[PDB]
Amino acid sequence: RYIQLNDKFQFTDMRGQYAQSAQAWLEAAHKTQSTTKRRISPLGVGIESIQRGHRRLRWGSMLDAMRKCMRRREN
Amino acid sequence: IKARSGVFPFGESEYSLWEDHWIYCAEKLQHWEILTELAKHEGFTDLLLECGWRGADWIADREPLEQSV
Amino acid sequence: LRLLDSPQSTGSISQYLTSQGLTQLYNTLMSAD
């Protein structure tokens, strides 16, 4: 996420151990994203379009579970 | 239910606690089948805990379990 | 006061505790759009 948001990243600028392995992983991820439309790199979404897994919209599935728990207890 | 009905002020703090501890008490009380759909819908790490380790057989339908692991 | 005071509440959950009440609440909140 930091590399994505910086936007001033350079591959050869990086120094330290694990440099080559992470470089290879990033190159493979970019190649996979180019070839396959599926997204691997993290992406940011505004507060308007809250998606399925977020904490804001747990309550729907949770209330479904709550209703089934009530059903079982009433049975 | 009270928090989501707006009867008293709604605070995310301790609401995360309510959610997580409800899941905890549900899994302790052996409500695995109910938690299956919740894990599938939200995405979690207890999907392995309940779906395979206590629900569906491992020898069958191996591929989804392998992908999850 | 911070330790010992709890926000007030109203007893409107008597009907919602029933499973049918939860179905009604789920339908209303899902279709709130």
Binding site: I47, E48, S49, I50, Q51, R56, L57, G60 | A3, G6, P9, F10, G11, E12 | P7, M30, A32, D33
Partner: peptide, 12 residues
């Protein structure tokens, strides 16, 4: 707009 509506609630 998302599938699930997002509505503001009062806080502490």
């Amino acid at each position: 707009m998302s599938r699930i509506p997002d509505m503001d609630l009062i806080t502490v």
